[PDB]
Amino acid sequence: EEGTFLFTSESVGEGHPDKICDQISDAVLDAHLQQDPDAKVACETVAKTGMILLAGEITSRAAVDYQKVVREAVKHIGYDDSSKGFDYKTCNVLVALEQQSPDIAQGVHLDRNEEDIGAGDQGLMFGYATDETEECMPLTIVLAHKLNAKLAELRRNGTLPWLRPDSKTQVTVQYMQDRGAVLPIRVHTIVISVQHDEEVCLDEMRDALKEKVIKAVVPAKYLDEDTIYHLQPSGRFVIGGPQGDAGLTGRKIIVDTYGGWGAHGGGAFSGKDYTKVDRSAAYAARWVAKSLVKGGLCRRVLVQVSYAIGVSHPLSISIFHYGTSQKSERELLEIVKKNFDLRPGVIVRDLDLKKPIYQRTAAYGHFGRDSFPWEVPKKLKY
Amino acid sequence: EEGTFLFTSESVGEGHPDKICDQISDAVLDAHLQQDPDAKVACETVAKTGMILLAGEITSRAAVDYQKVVREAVKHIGYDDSSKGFDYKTCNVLVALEQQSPDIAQGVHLDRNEEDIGAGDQGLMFGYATDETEECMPLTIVLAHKLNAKLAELRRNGTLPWLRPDSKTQVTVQYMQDRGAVLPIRVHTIVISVQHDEEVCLDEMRDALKEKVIKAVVPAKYLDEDTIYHLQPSGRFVIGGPQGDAGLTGRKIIVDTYGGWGAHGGGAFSGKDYTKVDRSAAYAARWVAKSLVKGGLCRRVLVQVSYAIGVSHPLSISIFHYGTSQKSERELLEIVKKNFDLRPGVIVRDLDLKKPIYQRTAAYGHFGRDSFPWEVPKKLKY
Numbered sequence: 106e107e108g109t110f111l112f113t114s115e116s117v118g119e120g121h122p123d124k125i126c127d128q129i130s131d132a133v134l135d136a137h138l139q140q141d142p143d144a145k146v147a148c149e150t151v152a153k154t155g156m157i158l159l160a161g162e163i164t165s166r167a168a169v170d171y172q173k174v175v176r177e178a179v180k181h182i183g184y185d186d187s188s189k190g191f192d193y194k195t196c197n198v199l200v201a202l203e204q205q206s207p208d209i210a211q212g213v214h215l216d217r218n219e220e221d222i223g224a225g226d227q228g229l230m231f232g233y234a235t236d237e238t239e240e241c242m243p244l245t246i247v248l249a250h251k252l253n254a255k256l257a258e259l260r261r262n263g264t265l266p267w268l269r270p271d272s273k274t275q276v277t278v279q280y281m282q283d284r285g286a287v288l289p290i291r292v293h294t295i296v297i298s299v300q301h302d303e304e305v306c307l308d309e310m311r312d313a314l315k316e317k318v319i320k321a322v323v324p325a326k327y328l329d330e331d332t333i334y335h336l337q338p339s340g341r342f343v344i345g346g347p348q349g350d351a352g353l354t355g356r357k358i359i360v361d362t363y364g365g366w367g368a369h370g371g372g373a374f375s376g377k378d379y380t381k382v383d384r385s386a387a388y389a390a391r392w393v394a395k396s397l398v399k400g401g402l403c404r405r406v407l408v409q410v411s412y413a414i415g416v417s418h419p420l421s422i423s424i425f426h427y428g429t430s431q432k433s434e435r436e437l438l439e440i441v442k443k444n445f446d447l448r449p450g451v452i453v454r455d456l457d458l459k460k461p462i463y464q465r466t467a468a469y470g471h472f473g474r475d476s477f478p479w480e481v482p483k484k485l486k487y
Numbered sequence: 488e489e490g491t492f493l494f495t496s497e498s499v500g501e502g503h504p505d506k507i508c509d510q511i512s513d514a515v516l517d518a519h520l521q522q523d524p525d526a527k528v529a530c531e532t533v534a535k536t537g538m539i540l541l542a543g544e545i546t547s548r549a550a551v552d553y554q555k556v557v558r559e560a561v562k563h564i565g566y567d568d569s570s571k572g573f574d575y576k577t578c579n580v581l582v583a584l585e586q587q588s589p590d591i592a593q594g595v596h597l598d599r600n601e602e603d604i605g606a607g608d609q610g611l612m613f614g615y616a617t618d619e620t621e622e623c624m625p626l627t628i629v630l631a632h633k634l635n636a637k638l639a640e641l642r643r644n645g646t647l648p649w650l651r652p653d654s655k656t657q658v659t660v661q662y663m664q665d666r667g668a669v670l671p672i673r674v675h676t677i678v679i680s681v682q683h684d685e686e687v688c689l690d691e692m693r694d695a696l697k698e699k700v701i702k703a704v705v706p707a708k709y710l711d712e713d714t715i716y717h718l719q720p721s722g723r724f725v726i727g728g729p730q731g732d733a734g735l736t737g738r739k740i741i742v743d744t745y746g747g748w749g750a751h752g753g754g755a756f757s758g759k760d761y762t763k764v765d766r767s768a769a770y771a772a773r774w775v776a777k778s779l780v781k782g783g784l785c786r787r788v789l790v791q792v793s794y795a796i797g798v799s800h801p802l803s804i805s806i807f808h809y810g811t812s813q814k815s816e817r818e819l820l821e822i823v824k825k826n827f828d829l830r831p832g833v834i835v836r837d838l839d840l841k842k843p844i845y846q847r848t849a850a851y852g853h854f855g856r857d858s859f860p861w862e863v864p865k866k867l868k869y
């Protein structure tokens with residue numbers, strides 16, 4: 106017990122109503138980028154019973170069929186029948202989209218060289234990396250995401266046909282201190298809540314969630330007789346998706362990042378093109394942090410950057426190594442300065458941020474998966 | 488420079504479109520609570536040009552005039568004419584509100600003793616306190632909020648009649664390490680962006696923002712010849728409010744809390760009654776953290792708690808004192824156990840969370856202001 110502590114993170118499934126909105130917002134972004142790599146996109150999505158509303162600002166040369174893009178995203182998630190609470194074929198899709206404000210456009214990107222475009226807004230952003238997993242992510246959030254992915258897998262393969270797309274999971278891990286780094290010891294508590302059909306009973310669900318979901322995801326070495334399980338703790342979850350709870354874009358920002366570890370500056374990712382530093386600078390900050398850890402300079406590290414609207418270079422850059430670096434904080438900042446250029450008009454080139462890959466980022470976290478450009482460490486010169 | 492670092496936080500004004508939504512959601516909550524202290528409220532607000540949409544779930548004995556509640560909140564904020572981009576008298580108010588899901592109700596509160604109500608959702612929440620200011624908040628966020636409040640003051644008193652309600656500010660402070668605590672040294676950079684009328688010029692605005700806003704808020708001892716000012720950095724901000732940028736409830740969660748310090752579990756506060764632990768447990772965690780600091784046990788402290796839907800007691804409670812306590816982490820946890828009961832049905836009594844004071848929390852941060860119950864430290868027994 107000496108030197109140990111508990112930490113909890115959560116994740117949600119593809120049909121969680123907030124995550125539906127993130128995925129739709131990024132499907133819209135991708136559709137624009139497929140035709141206009143320089144589309145300016147700020148697409149919020151709102152979901153409630155029978156309704157997807159798109160609201161925001163897009164200036165783009167693309168011709169996008171919003172009805173088709175939205176409905177295909179909902180179909181992919183799995184909401185295809187009134188019996189499940191939501192159906193892509195028959196829901197309302199409402200659009201309240203205007204051009205980007207000309208005042209923003211003139212102050213950010215109009216008549217600017219691409220590398221010297223200003224940040225699309227002010228704000229602060231953080232990147233984090235931890236050596237506790239190979240992918241440099243906290244175990245709590247990785248396991249929580251993988252539990253949701255397993256539910257979707259067993260729904261889609263017909264193993265557990267009573268499952269529906271809306272789910273939430275939560276994992277509490279006991280950690281040991283290790284010279285500023287952290288070492289996972291065991292799983293203390295798991296929560297799983299998932300929408301289900303009217304016919305399956307709680308005992309069938311709880312047994313399946315333990316044997317076919319948890320045991321198929323969480324290594325047995327982390328589970329013991331004392332692990333606490335809260336499986337379908339509400340007792341009934343037939344109503345779900347947007348019918349059970351309104352969804353909005355950008356309401357799962359901690360799920361999207363580090364599960365509470367590190368820090369967060371408040372900005373949402375989905376529905377935004379590269380000029381919105383909330384996304385591009387957070388991706389670049391992750392890339393920096395992961396590069397420092399994979400480069401052997403830190404075991405655990407947090408990077409902050411901040412911007413002013415219309416100004417290309419960050420206003421501030423800061424680093425905290427948790428006592429896990431032999432280099433000083435000053436030396437780390439110099440290494441980052443010499444190896445990275447965090448202007449948005451340079452990040453876009455380094456991370457290929459005009460490519461329409463964003464819908465793939467919008468469930469199961471933006472980091473630690475799939476070797477996206479910000480997950481491929483840069484070789485550092487020093 | 489040795490032992491120092493930079494940190495940035497931001498805040499937004501009452502007419503920032505996300506903050507409009509938070510305030511409307513809490514005006515709706517308050518209106519329900521005035522008539523039904525036990526109202527179940529989950530009210531999201533969305534704002535775009537000419538539109539306020541309410542979406543979510545409310546079960547309540549109250550009879551609420553949503554048109555009146557929404558329009559009065561917008562009037563208070565100051566959007567009262569088409570020349571400002573938005574007018575409470577003439578905007579569209581659309582309502583997509585349903586009852587709370589019966590499946591949630593049965594699993595959370597139906598036929599439960601109030602003290603033993605379950606958490607209204609799973610999730611994780613943090614509370615933070617720092618002795619660097621008397622109110623136990625980070626200086627970066629306090630100053631950022633006060634800059635926005637000063638803008639609203641000079642708008643309302645007619646000093647600077649070209650101001651409009653939508654604003655954002657951002658403050659970067661140089662800090663010194665102090666045995667795990669932090670000591671503010673100076674202000675490194677200030678950003679202010681505020682919506683303005685068509686007639687005032689940039690030089691008049693920038694001079695006023697420096698002399699009448701910054702100097703009226705930030706002590707001169709923090710400002711020097713090297714401080715960087717980004718005042719109206721976009722160059723033009725005539726279009727603003729929802730017309731310039733869509734607003735949604737729960738998109739300023741870092742502004743609402745600690746400006747990036749501490750940690751955040753991802754849950755939004757506004758529009759939610761006490762059974763939604765995203766709000767009540769975050770408020771209680773702040774109360775715990777502030778009580779530990781004001782009790783002289785810590786100089787700086789972070790508390791995590793987590794819940795499962797339908798379960799009253801937290802699943803986990805954890806504490807980090809940043810090396811600023813003479814008591815061990817184990818001893819602090821025992822003190823918290825002996826002095827606090829973090830079931831939502833007890834928090835509601837301790838913090839008086841049926842009282843309709845929530846609209847007042849929804850701008851300028853939920854913490855560090857106005858001696859709300861969670862800001863009054865508990866005298867600890869140990």
Ligand SMILES: Cc1[nH]c2c(N3CCCCC3)c(-c3ccccc3)nn2c(=O)c1-c1ccc(O)cc1
Nearest residue numbers: 282283284285286365366367750789791805806807
């Ligand atoms: C003991 C400890 N606790 C701790 C905490 N806690 C965990 C429980 C809830 C509150 C925050 C966080 C944290 C987690 C997330 C966000 C922000 C801060 N970091 N962190 C540590 O680094 C250490 C530590 C590690 C290695 C070492 O050698 C000495 C100390």
Ligand SMILES: Cc1[nH]c2c(N3CCCCC3)c(-c3ccccc3)nn2c(=O)c1-c1ccc(O)cc1
Nearest residue numbers: 368407409423424425664665666667668747748749
């Ligand atoms: C030097 C240092 N830096 C630091 C950081 N940084 C700041 C810049 C950007 C990245 C995070 C944070 C932090 C801030 C917000 C969220 C999460 C973590 N905490 N923190 C520290 O506690 C210390 C420290 C203080 C006293 C001491 O005696 C020794 C060290």
Ligand SMILES: C[S@@+](CC[C@H](N)C(=O)[O-])C[C@H]1O[C@@H](n2cnc3c(N)ncnc32)[C@H](O)[C@@H]1O
Nearest residue numbers: 122298339341342349350529544587590591608
């Ligand atoms: C519990 S609902 C949030 C509170 C809700 N807005 C209300 O009106 O009380 C939040 C999320 O939990 C999940 N959820 C919905 N219904 C649920 C149920 N009956 N049991 C468990 N989780 C549920 C869904 O993922 C949903 O998006």
Ligand SMILES: C[S@@+](CC[C@H](N)C(=O)[O-])C[C@H]1O[C@@H](n2cnc3c(N)ncnc32)[C@H](O)[C@@H]1O
Nearest residue numbers: 147162205208209226504680721723724731732
């Ligand atoms: C810059 S807008 C976000 C990006 C925007 N959605 C777009 O379409 O590019 C975000 C916030 O910045 C502020 N803002 C809006 N127009 C602005 C302008 N012309 N100059 C500076 N800040 C502005 C408002 O507070 C607004 O809510």
